[PDB]
């Protein structure tokens, strides 16, 4: 047993109204679904690569949503935000790499970085869900904003905020802005067949975290499960 | 034996809408100082009665300008500056005796004594200020109905306070006294036009809208089925508290934050509070417009919301052009859950097939009625000579749709009116060339479809 | 439900024994922290301790007693908080 | 790795749109996803930022000659040519 | 008789009656405070009542029962509120009526019979307890408008910098168990503050009630009281509310973070927020002068990096308001100055300086002083020199010389 740390690579696995861990349909598509024929713990996914997340702490946007608003609706002004969004980025990933290796507890944010496509899981509290219509929409965004923040709060009574979050342990993973606990329904993609929708709405659904690497093993001069190699 | 029963507050200002061993000496000085409040009270009765009285003469005797000044050397000539009310004083040193008494009590144990020799303490050096807030907070009335209209309107609302700010024991007797209550305040409230004008002055005077308000703050349960009428009839007696009244309009739009909930009730509130009144419509905050595009995206697609941003565009004739820009700026973000059209072979043979029920007369809160609300609010977003939200909305619905729809056999006057005023606005009168429109054999089709609805207009005339 | 959890007059038999299991990770099998939350398990059944709904007064008006049991598997949520009584009460 | 998964999920989702216009019938979304998705392979052949400049005009320096070896070996120039000639061949 | 015609002449004898009599109230309200000075004049000289009232009792009796009555009525605490802040007030006059009304009430009741004067009084009610009454106020209140009160009564108190006043502060935040919650209020409030303007960037009462805390906290710290200026850095209690840090946390929101300070100042500062801006400036002058070591290394060395901001606000000039006001802009720049000097008086050593010039390139800052010294045309009708200012930066390049061989070499003259 162990504790989950800033940059762990982890799988979710969900308990809900379905049973099954948290895929991606692909890089091109980013709509996040579970699949509860392609395996549970005992038997894991064949392809349990997709199914990796990394935990990273919280991120700044304020400058990249001033930008993006600047886009969407001068030439100085345009110029001088990008240099902020740029430079909040960098400030992110010097806080990131600081930051790096500590300790998780309960009731702080994260951010859940799917490996795969390098990409962040986000909320969106102003699209419904594709099918739930009464939920809100889960996608998959690169650049990631503050729909990525998560609060990560304990399923179990035992545990309270502040307590260090332990590996295998059930949790909630609450989103900031939208306020409501992902969940896993039971609702089926009409393109892809097997695959459940994961949205943002009330429910009971948990998130048993299963570690897959750890954070000082993820250093890029060994050999590891799960690496690309050709012989 | 000694009760120590306490009133209502005694050193309470009027408004319209309303241990120790000596204790025997404390108790007997406390209430001679509830005695004293009650002739201060009298006093400034009978200061506002003589106002009243010189203003009357006044309005009497200029007609059978008003003489401003000789009123004001009157209304100062009361307030002790000279004899003329010196009768009123209520102590034989003009007023040492009373102050140092009140001092001297200041300096007791007994803390309500204390308090209540304050309170007088500072209303003696107040009187100038509690007389014109009384003044002003007086009501005219010139009929025997309306003083017994006042009296009932009155004590229904004490009655509704009370419950409200007692809501915690029916939310099985006190359902049925607030439904009779509410429904018999929105009967009284509207007639005519100069009685309701008269209703709208006179619950915006006595402060009706802040019960209003709060009887729908009250924590509910999500199904009752019961106290679903009390509110629907709370809102009613709010959309007839709006009509025409610019006033009452701002301020229940000061408590618009009350009203930003997913609900459809709520909209007809909004849009009346709204309707009418440039001054609200053209400063617009942004929230709200998301707000109810948000509720057309997740909520559903109902015709209140599409209600209320048609009236917000155009106010007193004039066009709002950032609510047009906003609106359509936000309603194109949003596709296949908001804006849906039927440009599809298949979409444009559902359309035919749902509105062939329609023959008879589209039915209220249709997606037939909500399609023609969203082409006419798309119509009416452009119809300032714009140059953004006209080209904006070009793509939307193309003119081959338009015109494939309007040429149909089985086409209704509803959708032919929107399709018509869609082409118009959007198309036809613009401040930019549209290659479409002239270089092309569209337009062309749809004149002689309204030659042909000439002719029909002249058989069924002739018939 | 398979076994229920009673009191017996004699603590000097087999079956009044129990083992506590952690709930979160410990200094290397030190000393048990005081105020803990940890997991009963029967010697003698090698059994996990566990809650019911299943009133025991169900003939009163309002039911207040729960039963308890033991199940040879083992669940993560049932645990039990071992809150100290001062000396002085 | 991930450019490798990328050139494969474009080659499915090209040869879906393929399979569709064969059918005869694309849904307005299913057109607008597939143009995204060909700015998206233009942009990932031509190894350039996406900085709001036009698609259809982009000057590439030295060109990647694994991108090419990708798109080649995935077939996505297969499927490019497929949803050049299937359209052609009423719709 | 028409309805209409009756309500119209109605509403304008109303409202010119409501003209006509403002300046008679406030003669009274005048007369009030005055009898409240002087309570004692209205009760035979030999009387037992006449001396409780002239040895105080009375007032002390009033600051006493308006902690009791705070409770219930708040209405007629507030009234007591600003009575006393009237009472700590300068004399006004209301016009030729409003004298003569206030000298007929004076003689009716009162028959018998500056600076200094403002002093004597803040100490006069200072021992009657008001001190006492604002801290406890302010401590248990859950009213807004109370706290307003009570924040607006301790101004007045302090205001001119009453050593005395500070006195009475400092042993009752050490002596009262309160003290703590009274800085956890205190840090809570700054803390909403905070948050409302990030979230908002009119000005809500969140943020404009940071004026007044701002004033409170400067005149406490006023006359370089170490006592207080440490004390507000850290007290000796089991939990510890810094009020450095979230005041300079509060200036770095206001003016942008990381943004403001990479060239877009201006956007985050306008006509309505300038104020707010300098007054935060003045009191993170106030806590740095004397000097105060640990509140400098505080303010120069906390993470949110508000002397980027500092810098930027002498680098960077306000593109939209300086074109229509520029008094402000040269206020703001005089105080960003003043406060790089007070961080900057006596430190011997270099790590302040390093952090300094880590924004404040020395060719930008030369490129200002010349900027300033040049632009003496714009002191037509202003009360701040841009040479004066130009002259304080270049004093200030002169002190980050010592440890900047370039700065050096660039301020010397050709």
Not at chain 2, 99 to 125: C, E, N, W
Request: aromatic residues 8%; glycine residues 4%; hydrophobic residues 40%.
């Amino acid at each position: 047993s162990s504790f989950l740390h800033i940059g762990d690579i982890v799988s979710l696995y969900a308990e809900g109204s379905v049973n099954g861990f948290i895929s991606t349909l692909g890089l091109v598509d980013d709509r996040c679904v579970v699949e509860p024929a392609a395996g549970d713990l005992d038997n894991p996914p064949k392809k349990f690569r997709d199914c990796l997340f990394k935990v990273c702490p919280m991120n700044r946007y304020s400058a990249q949503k001033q930008y993006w608003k600047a886009k969407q609706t001068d030439v100085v002004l345009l110029q001088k935000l990008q240099h902020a969004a740029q430079m909040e980025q960098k400030q992110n990933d010097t806080e990131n790499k600081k930051v790096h290796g500590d300790v998780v507890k309960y009731g702080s944010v994260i951010q859940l970085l799917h490996m795969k496509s390098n990409k962040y899981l986000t909320v969106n509290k102003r699209l419904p869900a594709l099918l739930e219509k009464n939920a809100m929409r889960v996608t998959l965004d690169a650049t990631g904003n503050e729909g990525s923040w998560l609060f990560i709060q304990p399923f179990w009574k035992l545990r309270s905020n502040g307590d260090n979050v332990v590996v295998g342990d059930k949790v909630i993973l609450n989103p900031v802005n939208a306020g409501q606990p992902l969940h896993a329904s039971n609702y089926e993609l009409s393109d892809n067949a097997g695959c459940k929708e994961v949205n943002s709405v009330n429910c009971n659904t948990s998130w048993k975290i299963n570690l897959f690497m750890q954070f000082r093993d993820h250093l890029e001069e060994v050999l590891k499960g799960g690496d690309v190699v050709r012989l | 034996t000694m009760v120590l029963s306490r009133k209502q507050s005694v050193f309470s200002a009027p408004s319209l809408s309303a241990e120790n061993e000596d204790i025997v000496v404390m108790e007997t000085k406390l209430k001679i100082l509830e005695i004293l409040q009650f002739i201060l009270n009298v006093r400034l009765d009978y200061r506002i009665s003589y106002l009243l009285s010189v203003f009357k003469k006044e309005f009497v005797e200029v007609f059978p300008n008003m003489n401003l000044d000789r009123i004001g050397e009157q209304a100062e000539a009361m307030f002790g500056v000279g004899k003329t009310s010196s009768m009123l004083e209520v102590d034989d040193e003009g007023g040492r005796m009373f102050l140092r008494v009140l001092i001297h009590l200041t300096m007791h144990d007994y803390a309500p004594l204390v308090s209540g020799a304050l309170q007088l303490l500072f209303k003696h050096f107040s009187q100038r200020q509690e007389a014109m807030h009384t003044f002003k907070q007086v009501q005219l009335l010139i009929s025997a109905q309306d003083v017994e209209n006042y009296k009932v309107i009155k004590s229904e609302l004490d009655r509704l306070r009370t419950m409200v700010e007692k809501s915690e024991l029916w939310v099985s007797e006190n359902y049925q006294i607030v439904k009779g209550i509410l429904e018999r305040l929105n009967k009284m409230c509207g007639v005519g036009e100069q009685m309701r004008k008269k209703q709208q002055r006179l619950l915006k005077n006595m402060d009706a809208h802040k019960v209003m308000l709060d009887l729908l703050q009250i924590p509910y349960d999500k199904g009752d089925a019961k106290m679903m009428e009390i509110l629907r009839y709370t809102h009613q007696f709010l959309q007839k508290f709006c009509a025409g009244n610019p006033g009452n309009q701002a301020l229940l739009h000061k408590h618009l934050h009350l009203f930003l909930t997913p609900g459809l009730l709520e909209a007809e509130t909004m849009q009346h509070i709204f309707l009418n009144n440039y001054q609200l419509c053209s400063e617009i905050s942004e929230p709200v417009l998301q707000h109810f595009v948000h509720l057309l995206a997740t909520h559903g697609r109902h015709v209140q919301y599409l209600d209320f941003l048609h009236t917000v565009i155009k106010a007193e004739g004039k066009y709002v052009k950032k609510c047009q820009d906003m609106i359509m700026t936000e309603l194109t973000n949003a596709g296949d859950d908001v804006v849906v059209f039927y440009n599809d072979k298949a979409s444009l043979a559902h359309l035919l097939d749902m509105m062939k029920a329609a023959r008879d007369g589209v039915e209220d809160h249709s997606p037939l009625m909500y399609h023609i609300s969203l082409v006419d609010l798309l119509a009416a977003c452009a119809e300032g000579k714009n140059v953004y939200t006209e080209i904006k909305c070009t793509s939307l619905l193309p003119l081959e749709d338009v015109v494939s729809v309007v040429t149909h056999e089985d086409c209704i006057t509803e959708v032919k009116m929107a399709y018509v005023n869609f082409v118009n606005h959007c198309y036809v009168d613009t401040e930019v060339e549209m290659k479409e429109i002239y270089t092309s054999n569209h337009i062309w089709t749809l004149f002689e479809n309204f030659t042909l609805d000439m002719a029909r207009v002249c058989s069924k005339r002739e018939k | 439900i398979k076994y229920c959890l009673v009191a017996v007059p004699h603590g000097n038999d087999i079956a009044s024994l129990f083992e506590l299991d952690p709930t979160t990770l410990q200094k290397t099998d030190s000393f048990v922290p005081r105020n803990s939350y940890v997991r009963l398990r029967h010697l003698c059944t090698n059994t996990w301790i566990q809650s019911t709904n299943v009133p025991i007064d169900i003939e009163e008006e309002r039911p207040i007693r729960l039963m308890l049991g033991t199940c040879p598997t083992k669940e993560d949520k049932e645990a039990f908080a071992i809150v100290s009584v001062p000396v002085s009460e | 790795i991930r450019d490798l998964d990328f050139a494969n999920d474009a080659s499915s989702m090209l040869a879906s749109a393929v399979e569709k216009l064969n059918e005869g019938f694309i849904s307005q979304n299913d057109r607008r996803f597939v143009i995204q998705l060909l700015e998206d392979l233009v942009f990932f052949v031509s190894d350039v930022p996406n900085n709001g400049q036009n698609v259809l005009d982009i000057m590439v320096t030295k060109p990647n000659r694994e991108r090419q070896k990708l798109m080649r070996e995935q077939n996505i120039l297969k499927q490019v040519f497929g949803i050049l000639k299937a359209p052609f061949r009423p719709l | 008789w028409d309805y209409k015609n009756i309500i119209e002449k109605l509403q304008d004898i109303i409202t010119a009656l409501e003209e006509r009599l403002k300046p008679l109230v406030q003669a009274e309200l005048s007369v009030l405070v005055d009898v409240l000075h002087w309570p004692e004049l209205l009760f035979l000289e030999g009387s037992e009542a006449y001396q409780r009232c002239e040895s105080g009792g009375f007032l002390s009796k009033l600051i006493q029962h308006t902690k009791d009555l705070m409770e219930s009525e708040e209405k007629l605490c507030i009234k007591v509120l600003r009575t006393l802040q009237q009472m700590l007030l300068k004399k006004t006059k209301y016009g030729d009526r409003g004298n003569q009304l206030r000298k007929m009430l004076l003689q009716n009741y009162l028959q018998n019979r500056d600076w200094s004067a403002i002093a004597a009084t803040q100490c006069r009610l200072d021992k009657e307890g008001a001190t006492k009454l604002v801290c406890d106020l302010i401590t248990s209140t859950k009213n807004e408008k109370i706290f307003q009160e009570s924040i607006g009564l301790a101004i007045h108190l302090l205001d001119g910098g009453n050593t005395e006043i500070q006195k009475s502060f400092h042993n009752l935040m050490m002596s009262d168990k309160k003290s703590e919650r009274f800085f956890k209020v205190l840090h809570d409030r700054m803390k909403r503050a905070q948050q409302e303007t990030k979230s908002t960037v009119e000005m809500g009462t969140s943020v404009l009630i940071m004026q007044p805390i701002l004033r409170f906290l400067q005149l406490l710290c006023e006359n370089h009281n170490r006592d207080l200026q440490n004390f507000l850095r850290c007290q000796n209690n089991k939990t510890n509310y810094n009020l450095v840090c979230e005041t300079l946390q509060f200036l770095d929101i206001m003016c942008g973070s990381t943004t403001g300070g990479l060239g877009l100042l201006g956007l985050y500062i306008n006509e309505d927020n300038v104020g707010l801006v300098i007054q935060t400036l003045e009191t993170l002058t106030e806590y740095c002068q004397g000097p105060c070591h640990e509140n400098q290394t505080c303010i120069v060395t906390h993470e949110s990096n508000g002397i980027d901001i500092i810098t930027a606000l002498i680098l960077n000039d306000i593109s939209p308001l300086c074109k229509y006001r520029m008094d402000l802009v040269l206020q703001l720049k005089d105080n960003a100055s003043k406060l790089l000097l007070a961080l900057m008086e006596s430190r011997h050593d270099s790590e302040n300086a390093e952090r300094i010039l880590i924004s404040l390139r020395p060719q930008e800052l030369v490129d200002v002083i010349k900027k300033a010294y040049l632009q003496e045309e714009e002191r037509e009708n202003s009360e701040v020199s841009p040479r004066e200012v130009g002259h304080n930066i270049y004093i200030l390049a002169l002190q980050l010389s010592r440890h900047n061989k370039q700065l050096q070499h660039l301020l010397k003259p050709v």
